[PDB]
């Protein structure tokens, strides 16, 4: 299909975040349907879509590892990390805002996966 890109946007894209504190994470993780069960860690990329899609080409990306592409430019991002002992709501999240390049996988010139490993830090 082409729904994997749409799904990437739902899970990992927020053009203009409001605050990027804990409450930001707790709200958007709900809004985007990521709390049943609670996703343990999830990162949102900010800014415009075109820069992110550009990672899929030489314009803003380099091949990376075995199935991945890494951006040349840095993005504002926010990482939401699950807090507390339970996998189930209420989902408490700690927010970590950051600014760096991102790793994705691309299909047909569109990002379809965000590599969360670089934000487990």
From Swiss-Prot:
The active site is at residues 12, 113. Changing residue 65 to A: Abolished binding to PLXNB2 receptor. Secreted ribonuclease that can either promote or restrict cell proliferation of target cells, depending on the context. Endocytosed in target cells via its receptor PLXNB2 and translocates to the cytoplasm or nucleus. Under stress conditions, localizes to the cytoplasm and promotes the assembly of stress granules (SGs): specifically cleaves a subset of tRNAs within anticodon loops to produce tRNA-derived stress-induced fragments (tiRNAs), resulting in translation repression and inhibition of cell proliferation. tiRNas also prevent formation of apoptosome, thereby promoting cell survival. The keyword Nuclease applies. It is linked to Amyotrophic lateral sclerosis 9: A neurodegenerative disorder affecting upper motor neurons in the brain and lower motor neurons in the brain stem and spinal cord, resulting in fatal paralysis. Sensory abnormalities are absent. The pathologic hallmarks of the disease include pallor of the corticospinal tract due to loss of motor neurons, presence of ubiquitin-positive inclusions within surviving motor neurons, and deposition of pathologic aggregates. The etiology of amyotrophic lateral sclerosis is likely to be multifactorial, involving both genetic and environmental factors. Keywords: Amyotrophic lateral sclerosis, Angiogenesis, Cytoplasm, Developmental protein, Differentiation, Disease variant, Disulfide bond, DNA-binding, Endonuclease, Hydrolase, Neurodegeneration, Nuclease, Nucleus, Protein synthesis inhibitor, Pyrrolidone carboxylic acid, Secreted, Signal, Stress response. This is Angiogenin. Changing residue 94 to Q: Found in a patient with Parkinson disease; uncertain significance. It comes from Homo sapiens. Changing residue 120 to H: In ALS9; uncertain significance. Changing residue 111 to L: In ALS9; loss of angiogenic activity; reduced tRNA ribonucleolytic activity; unable to translocate to the nucleus. Its main location: secreted. It is found in: Secreted; Nucleus; Nucleus, Nucleolus; Cytoplasm, Stress granule. It is an enzyme of class 3 (hydrolase).
